[PDB]
Write a protein that holds these residues in place. Structure first.
Motif, mmCIF file in Angstrom:
data_model
loop_
_atom_site.group_PDB
_atom_site.id
_atom_site.type_symbol
_atom_site.label_atom_id
_atom_site.label_comp_id
_atom_site.label_asym_id
_atom_site.label_seq_id
_atom_site.Cartn_x
_atom_site.Cartn_y
_atom_site.Cartn_z
ATOM 1 N N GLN A 1 0.825 -1.195 0.000
ATOM 2 C CA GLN A 1 0.000 0.000 0.000
ATOM 3 C C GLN A 1 0.864 1.252 0.000
ATOM 4 N N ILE A 2 1.985 1.185 0.712
ATOM 5 C CA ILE A 2 2.921 2.303 0.777
ATOM 6 C C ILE A 2 3.619 2.512 -0.573
ATOM 7 N N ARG A 3 3.793 1.449 -1.346
ATOM 8 C CA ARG A 3 4.454 1.609 -2.639
ATOM 9 C C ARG A 3 3.498 2.170 -3.692
ATOM 10 N N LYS A 4 2.184 2.030 -3.440
ATOM 11 C CA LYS A 4 1.077 2.581 -4.278
ATOM 12 C C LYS A 4 1.029 4.077 -3.932
ATOM 13 N N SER A 5 1.458 4.326 -2.706
ATOM 14 C CA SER A 5 1.667 5.624 -2.124
ATOM 15 C C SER A 5 2.569 6.175 -3.169
ATOM 16 N N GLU A 6 2.949 7.454 -3.235
ATOM 17 C CA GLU A 6 2.661 8.631 -2.418
ATOM 18 C C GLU A 6 3.836 8.964 -1.470
ATOM 19 N N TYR A 7 4.773 8.029 -1.362
ATOM 20 C CA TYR A 7 5.969 8.183 -0.550
ATOM 21 C C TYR A 7 7.041 7.378 -1.245
ATOM 22 N N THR A 8 8.162 7.990 -1.533
ATOM 23 C CA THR A 8 9.262 7.277 -2.215
ATOM 24 C C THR A 8 10.359 6.913 -1.234
ATOM 25 N N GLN A 9 10.350 7.638 -0.109
ATOM 26 C CA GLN A 9 11.191 7.457 1.106
ATOM 27 C C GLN A 9 10.435 8.120 2.247
ATOM 28 N N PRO A 10 10.756 7.703 3.529
ATOM 29 C CA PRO A 10 10.004 8.388 4.586
ATOM 30 C C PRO A 10 10.330 9.858 4.819
ATOM 31 N N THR A 11 9.360 10.620 5.233
ATOM 32 C CA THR A 11 9.593 12.017 5.601
ATOM 33 C C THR A 11 10.271 12.098 6.979
ATOM 34 N N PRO A 12 10.889 13.245 7.317
ATOM 35 C CA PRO A 12 11.560 13.312 8.625
ATOM 36 C C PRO A 12 10.665 12.985 9.836
ATOM 37 N N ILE A 13 9.430 13.470 9.855
ATOM 38 C CA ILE A 13 8.559 13.219 10.994
ATOM 39 C C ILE A 13 8.202 11.729 11.052
ATOM 40 N N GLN A 14 8.178 11.074 9.898
ATOM 41 C CA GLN A 14 7.984 9.631 9.870
ATOM 42 C C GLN A 14 9.236 8.909 10.398
ATOM 43 N N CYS A 15 10.409 9.365 9.964
ATOM 44 C CA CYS A 15 11.674 8.759 10.367
ATOM 45 C C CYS A 15 11.808 8.630 11.882
ATOM 46 N N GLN A 16 11.403 9.663 12.607
ATOM 47 C CA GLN A 16 11.493 9.640 14.057
ATOM 48 C C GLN A 16 10.182 9.206 14.722
ATOM 49 N N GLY A 17 9.050 9.667 14.197
ATOM 50 C CA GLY A 17 7.758 9.382 14.807
ATOM 51 C C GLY A 17 7.328 7.927 14.712
ATOM 52 N N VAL A 18 7.656 7.260 13.609
ATOM 53 C CA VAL A 18 7.260 5.853 13.485
ATOM 54 C C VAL A 18 7.985 4.974 14.539
ATOM 55 N N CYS B 1 -10.953 15.381 8.845
ATOM 56 C CA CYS B 1 -11.524 14.063 9.113
ATOM 57 C C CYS B 1 -11.597 13.244 7.843
ATOM 58 N N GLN B 2 -12.076 13.860 6.772
ATOM 59 C CA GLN B 2 -12.280 13.133 5.528
ATOM 60 C C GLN B 2 -10.952 12.758 4.880
ATOM 61 N N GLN B 3 -9.975 13.662 4.947
ATOM 62 C CA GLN B 3 -8.634 13.380 4.444
ATOM 63 C C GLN B 3 -7.978 12.246 5.224
ATOM 64 N N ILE B 4 -8.065 12.316 6.546
ATOM 65 C CA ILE B 4 -7.434 11.302 7.391
ATOM 66 C C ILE B 4 -8.147 9.970 7.193
ATOM 67 N N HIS B 5 -9.470 10.024 7.080
ATOM 68 C CA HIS B 5 -10.259 8.827 6.836
ATOM 69 C C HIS B 5 -9.853 8.174 5.519
ATOM 70 N N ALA B 6 -9.622 8.990 4.494
ATOM 71 C CA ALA B 6 -9.195 8.480 3.198
ATOM 72 C C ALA B 6 -7.854 7.766 3.315
ATOM 73 N N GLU B 7 -6.968 8.301 4.144
ATOM 74 C CA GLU B 7 -5.669 7.667 4.306
ATOM 75 C C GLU B 7 -5.791 6.367 5.094
ATOM 76 N N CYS B 8 -6.637 6.375 6.117
ATOM 77 C CA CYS B 8 -6.899 5.180 6.907
ATOM 78 C C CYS B 8 -7.484 4.059 6.078
ATOM 79 N N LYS B 9 -8.372 4.385 5.144
ATOM 80 C CA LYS B 9 -8.945 3.328 4.319
ATOM 81 C C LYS B 9 -7.903 2.820 3.330
ATOM 82 N N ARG B 10 -7.074 3.714 2.793
ATOM 83 C CA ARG B 10 -6.030 3.302 1.857
ATOM 84 C C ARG B 10 -5.041 2.330 2.495
ATOM 85 N N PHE B 11 -4.402 2.757 3.573
ATOM 86 C CA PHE B 11 -3.379 1.932 4.193
ATOM 87 C C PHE B 11 -3.976 0.775 4.970
#
Length: 436
Positions: free
Chosen positions: A61-78, A133-143
Motif C-alpha cells: 500500500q505504501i508503494r502505491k503511495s505517495e511516498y518514495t522514502q520516509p519524511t523526517p517526521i515519519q523517520c522519528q515518529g514511526v 476528518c475526511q482526508q485522514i479517513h481516506a488515508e486510513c482506508k487506503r493503508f
C-alpha cells in the motif's frame, strides 16, 4: 474483572543499521532530518522504510503511495509510536505526519482480538474539522486495506444517523471531531471501552476552535494506559499543559524550523529537610553573586520575609519583593535590582512581575513551586536570555509528588535527572508504574 483487557504497545525491532550508529552519527542524523527530540530514552530515528520493519502487505500500500522514502517526521515518529511510546509531534501540515501516526496504528490494531458485536473502535483519531476528518479517513482506508481494517468518520456537519449506522456496523478505527464523537458515545452508537490508541491531530487548531473541554473529556473517558499521540504546528502553554495532563512520558519531536530556542540549565538538589536549605544557601550564596544577580523564589509572604530577614542578618545586601507592596515600594526594589545596587532579591511568585533582568545568572527555587507551570515561569527569569545562567531547585523528601513532575519537565528539556531525584519520584506508585 478488576481491570481492562491487556494489550501490547511495543511492536518495534530496531534495525541493526540504526543500532550500529555511534552517538555522534545519531546526533548528526537528527540534525540532517532537522529534528529536535527530547523526553526519556527516545528511540533512535530510522531513515528508510526498511528500518521500520513493515511487512509486505503494508509496504504494498505504501508503494502505491505517495511516498518514495520516509519524511523526517515519519523517520522519528514511526519508531516512537511502534515502540509504544506517547508522542508530542510539533510539525506542520502535511509533513507526512498523518501517515506517521496511521502506520503504527495499523500494527497496533493487528495485534489485538478482532471486533466482537458491541465492540467500539481500537483506535480513535480526533480532528478539528470535517475536512481533515475526511482526508485522514481516506488515508486510513487506503493503508488500512493492507489488513482489511475498517474506518468510520464521524464529524459535525455530517448526517448523525448515517454515522450512527456506520458505527453500529463496527469499525476498528474512528476518525472524528470531538463533540460529535462524544455525542455518539452518550447515545451509545459506539463506546470507548476498546480504545487503546488515541491521536489528537492539530490540537492547537482544536483549542482555537473551542474544543479543549471536549478533547479533555475524551481523554478522561479512554483508559489511562492507552497510547496517546498529540500533534500541533505550534507549542504554546495551553497545549503543553494539555500534554502534561493527557500523555505519559512522551517523546517530544519538533521539526527544526518550527521551534527555535534553548533550555535553561537546571540543577536539582535533594536536601535533608526545609531548615537545612539555610546552610545550603549560606555556603553558596557568595559564589553565586560572583556570577551576577541572584533571584530567590518562595511562595508565601511569611517565608519571603523570614528568608530575607535572615539573609539581612547574615550580612547580605538584598531586597525583598512581595505582593502587599505598593507600586512605588515595588518599583524601588526592582530598580535597585536592575541597577545592581542589590545583588540578591527574595521574591514571591505573585510579586515577581518585572524581573526579566539580563544580569540574573542564578535563580533559586528555595521553596517548592505550587506546580510545574509556576516552576517553568520561575526558571524563565534565568539568563539564557543570555546564557551563563543556572536555575537551582531545592527539594526535600517531602516533595516526591512534585519530583515526579519535575523529572518529566527535565526530561522534556533534555536536562539531567540525577539518581537521587529519580529515586525520590519513583516512591509513588502513580509515577513508578505509569512511567513508560
Amino acid at each position: 474483572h478488576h481491570h481492562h483487557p491487556p494489550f501490547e504497545k511495543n511492536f518495534y525491532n530496531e534495525h541493526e543499521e540504526i543500532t550500529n550508529l555511534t552517538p555522534q552519527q545519531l546526533i548528526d542524523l537528527r540534525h540532517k532530518l532537522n529534528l529536535r527530540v527530547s523526553g526519556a530514552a527516545p528511540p533512535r530515528p530510522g531513515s528508510s522504510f526498511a528500518h521500520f520493519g513493515f511487512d509486505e502487505q503494508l509496504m504494498h500500500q505504501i508503494r502505491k503511495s505517495e511516498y518514495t522514502q520516509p519524511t523526517p517526521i515519519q523517520c522519528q515518529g514511526v519508531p516512537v509510536a511502534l515502540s509504544g511510546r506517547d508522542m508530542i509531534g510539533i510539525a506542520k501540515t502535511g509533513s507526512g505526519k498523518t501517515a506517521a501516526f496511521i502506520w503504527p496504528m495499523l500494527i497496533h490494531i493487528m495485534d489485538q482480538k478482532e471486533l466482537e458485536p458491541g465492540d467500539g473502535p481500537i483506535a480513535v483519531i480526533v480532528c478539528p474539522t470535517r475536512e481533515l476528518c475526511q482526508q485522514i479517513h481516506a488515508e486510513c482506508k487506503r493503508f488500512g486495506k493492507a489488513y482489511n481494517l475498517r474506518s468510520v468518520a464521524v464529524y459535525g456537519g455530517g448526517s448523525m444517523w448515517e454515522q450512527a449506522k456506520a458505527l453500529q456496523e463496527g469499525a476498528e478505527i474512528v476518525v472524528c471531531t470531538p463533540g460529535r464523537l462524544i455525542d455518539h458515545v452518550k447515545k451509545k452508537a459506539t463506546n470507548l471501552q476498546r480504545v487503546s490508541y488515541l491521536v489528537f491531530d492539530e490540537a492547537d487548531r482544536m483549542f482555537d476552535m473551542g474544543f479543549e473541554y471536549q478533547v479533555r473529556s475524551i481523554a478522561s473517558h479512554v483508559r489511562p494506559d492507552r497510547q496517546t499521540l498529540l500533534f500541533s504546528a505550534t507549542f504554546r502553554k495551553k497545549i503543553e499543559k494539555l500534554a502534561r495532563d493527557i500523555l505519559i512520558d512522551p517523546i517530544r519531536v519538533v521539526q527544526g524550523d518550527i521551534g527555535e530556542a534553548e533550555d535553561v540549565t537546571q540543577i536539582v538538589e535533594i536536601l535533608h529537610s526545609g531548615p537545612s536549605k539555610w546552610n545550603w544557601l549560606t555556603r553558596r550564596l557568595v559564589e553565586f553573586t560572583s556570577s551576577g544577580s541572584v533571584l530567590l523564589f518562595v511562595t508565601k509572604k511569611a517565608n519571603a520575609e523570614e528568608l530575607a530577614n535572615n539573609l539581612k542578618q547574615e550580612g547580605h545586601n538584598l531586597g525583598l519583593l512581595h505582593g502587599d507592596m505598593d507600586q512605588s515600594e515595588r518599583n524601588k526594589v526592582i530598580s535597585d535590582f536592575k541597577k545592581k545596587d542589590i545583588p540578591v532579591l527574595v521574591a514571591t511568585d505573585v510579586a515577581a512581575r518585572g524581573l526579566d533582568i539580563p544580569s540574573i545568572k542564578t535563580v533559586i527555587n528555595y521553596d517548592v513551586a505550587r506546580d510545574i507551570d509556576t516552576h517553568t515561569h520561575r526558571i524563565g527569569r534565568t539568563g539564557r536570555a543570555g546564557e551563563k545562567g543556572v536555575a537551582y531547585t531545592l527539594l526535600t523528601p517531602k516533595d516526591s509528588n512534585f519530583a515526579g513532575d519535575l523529572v518529566r519537565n527535565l526530561e522534556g528539556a533534555n536536562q539531567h535527572v540525577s539518581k537521587e531525584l529519580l529515586d525520590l519520584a519513583m516512591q509513588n506508585a502513580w509515577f513508578r508504574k505509569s512511567r513508560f
